[PDB]
Amino acid sequence: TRSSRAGLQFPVGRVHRLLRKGNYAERVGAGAPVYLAAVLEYLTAEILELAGNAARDNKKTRIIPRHLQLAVRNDEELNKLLGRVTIAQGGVL
């Protein structure tokens, strides 16, 4: 598996498949899917880490909309990345 040999948790192969099938360009470089999977994995890891931290602060083992939205909105970084975005069932800071 390309992902397993890559040591990234995201599907490099399926990312390549969608880049081909998404009419994005006629040919796709070998490293582009790899790089994109790496960045997606990194952003997911960052957000999940922040969500887990919010859940710990709230003394809950379960990561719920309010945990995720509270992470995104407290953190200025993700806040400016997803400012004009709304998380379903998510509460106000």
Binding site: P65, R84, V85, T86, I87, A88, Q89, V92
Partner: protein
């Protein structure tokens, strides 16, 4: 009554308190129904256009999400 009045004064109240409003004027409520009304017209218009293109006689959560994403507020949770 007409269902525009279905959005009750307590509902407008709770919205305002969440957004941080300390006090709400009696004139606020009609206009909140108005802005809610126009936003729903816009989003439902795009959603219905999506279904009409799709030859689908059923508005779909993906259609609503796509409409909102164009209007500039992407909605997460109902993706597919």
């Amino acid at each position: 009554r007409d269902n525009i009045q279905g959005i009750t004064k307590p509902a407008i109240r709770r919205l305002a308190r969440r957004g941080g409003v300390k006090r709400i004027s009696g004139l606020i409520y009609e206009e909140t129904r108005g802005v809610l009304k126009v936003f729903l017209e816009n989003v439902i218009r795009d959603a219905v256009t999506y279904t009409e293109h799709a030859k689908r006689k059923t508005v779909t959560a993906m259609d609503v999400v796509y409409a909102l994403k164009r209007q500039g507020r992407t909605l997460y949770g109902f993706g597919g």
